[PDB]
Amino acid sequence: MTKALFFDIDGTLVSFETHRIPSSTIEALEAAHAKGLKIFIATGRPKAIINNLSELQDRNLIDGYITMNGAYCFVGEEVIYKSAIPQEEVKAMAAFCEKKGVPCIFVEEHNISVCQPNEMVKKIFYDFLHVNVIPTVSFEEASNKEVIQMTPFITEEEEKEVLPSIPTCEIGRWYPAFADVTAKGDTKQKGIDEIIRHFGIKLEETMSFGDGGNDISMLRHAAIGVAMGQAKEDVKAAADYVTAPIDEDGISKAMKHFGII
Numbered sequence: 001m002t003k004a005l006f007f008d009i010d011g012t013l014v015s016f017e018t019h020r021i022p023s024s025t026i027e028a029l030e031a032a033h034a035k036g037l038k039i040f041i042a043t044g045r046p047k048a049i050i051n052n053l054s055e056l057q058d059r060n061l062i063d064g065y066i067t068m069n070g071a072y073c074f075v076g077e078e079v080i081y082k083s084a085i086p087q088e089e090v091k092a093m094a095a096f097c098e099k100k101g102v103p104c105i106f107v108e109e110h111n112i113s114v115c116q117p118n119e120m121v122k123k124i125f126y127d128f129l130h131v132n133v134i135p136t137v138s139f140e141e142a143s144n145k146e147v148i149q150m151t152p153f154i155t156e157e158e159e160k161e162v163l164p165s166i167p168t169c170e171i172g173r174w175y176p177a178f179a180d181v182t183a184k185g186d187t188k189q190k191g192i193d194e195i196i197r198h199f200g201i202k203l204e205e206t207m208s209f210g211d212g213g214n215d216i217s218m219l220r221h222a223a224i225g226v227a228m229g230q231a232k233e234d235v236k237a238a239a240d241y242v243t244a245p246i247d248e249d250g251i252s253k254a255m256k257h258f259g260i261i
């Protein structure tokens with residue numbers, strides 16, 4: 001039976017339409033918590049920009065975090081796993097984005113920076129997602145930092161063009177306009193493995209929930225993968241179960257279906 005729940009944030013817990021968590025999702029997680037489910041976040045966001053979970057956090061419902069697509073995982077105050085991108089690949093992404101004229105975010109353990117931000121950074125991160133403005137730094141300075149995640153604002157065509165210069169990194173998307181890049185093997189699947197190692201939970205006892213391409217590995221990896229009803233077809237196909245759309249009680253309905261609650 002299920003012991004650990006892994007939730008993506010954007011499009012899974014938090015609606016892109018309303019920018020809020022559905023009330024029935026909060027009630028479902030309350031009920032699961034009391035039954036002893038462990039509740040984990042599994043997000044491409046770095047901690048620095050997780051500004052949309054206060055309802056869950058203030059209710060003390062979250063037992064641990066997988067952030068930066070698995071490249072930075074912690075339980076309470078304790079970091080249980082982290083990684084960094086090979087510096088050659090950091091440099092090559094910075095050079096690519098600078099030449100192409102596209103912005104890129106560079107995330108360190110305790111700092112976050114953006115290089116050559118444009119209005120699409122503003123339109124998506126600040127105005128749509130209400131993320132606090134990220135400080136600007138030069139590509140040169142960013143290219144020398146110890147980087148856990150890079151988030152280039154590149155198309156899928158630009159992604160194919162920079163792929164040979166990030167030969168070992170993972171790349172995935174939770175939103176079409178940008179991608180997240182992390183070191184070899186660092187996907188939300190890695191995050192699940194680290195969290196369940198910490199708690200003595202078996203893979204066979206896990207359930208994941210997601211809406212995006214960066215959820216596919218964890219939808220496949222968990223014993224039961226749940227795709228949100230509005231997810232694209234390839235996300236749905238990676239899941240075991242497709243629930244209702246987020247704003248039609250999709251999380252609660254899935255949890256009830258399985259008898260989690």
Ligand SMILES: [Mg+2]
Binds near residue numbers: 010
């Ligand atoms: Mg998502």
